[PDB]
Amino acid sequence: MNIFEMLRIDEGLRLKIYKDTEGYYTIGIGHLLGIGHLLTKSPSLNAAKSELDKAIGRNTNGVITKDEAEKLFNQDVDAAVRGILRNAKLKPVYDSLDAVRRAALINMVFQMGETGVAGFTNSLRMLQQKRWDEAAVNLAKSRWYNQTPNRAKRVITTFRTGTWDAYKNL
């Protein structure tokens, strides 16, 4: 399996462009549209679907497919990797983590941004030392584990086992 199925379950693949509440167009897996020349609002549905169209290469009026949504995640997935690598706190940890454990990380990043993750200081210090079990335990004494227990459990199982067990049937 991969990170894409992972996040799909952990957040969700929306197939139809929905103009966020605050002011913003998302689609697929939280892939917003409009990020450009450092200005975040698309200025409409119509540039919304065009930017979207271009990405893809077809005339979706604001509707793509799951595969379509996938060739964007991985694109955002790499995009993220690019921010961590610039981040002195996460990078050293991320370097050492094996693929599965990387995804696990990347996963918290999609959910709370590099600072949030960068806040789990010793939990981080643990995964770098490869004291899985403890990192785990440590990760669950957070508001996070509490804010969202289910998603938290999965990610932490993934971090602790480095295997994909948690998603075995979703």
Swiss-Prot record:
Effect of residue 138 to M/F: 2-fold decrease in enzymatic activity
Reactions performed catalytically: Hydrolysis of (1->4)-beta-linkages between N-acetylmuramic acid and N-acetyl-D-glucosamine residues in a peptidoglycan and between N-acetyl-D-glucosamine residues in chitodextrins
Top-level taxon of origin: Viruses
Transmembrane feature ranges: none
Residues binding substrate, per UniProt: 38, 110, 123, 138
Record GO terms (molecular function): lysozyme activity
Mutagenesis / variant outcome for changing residue 138 to I: 5-fold decrease in enzymatic activity
EC numbers for this chain: 3.2.1.17
Presence of the UniProt keyword Hydrolase in the record: yes
Protein name per the record: Endolysin
Taxonomic placement: Viruses, Duplodnaviria, Heunggongvirae, Uroviricota, Caudoviricetes
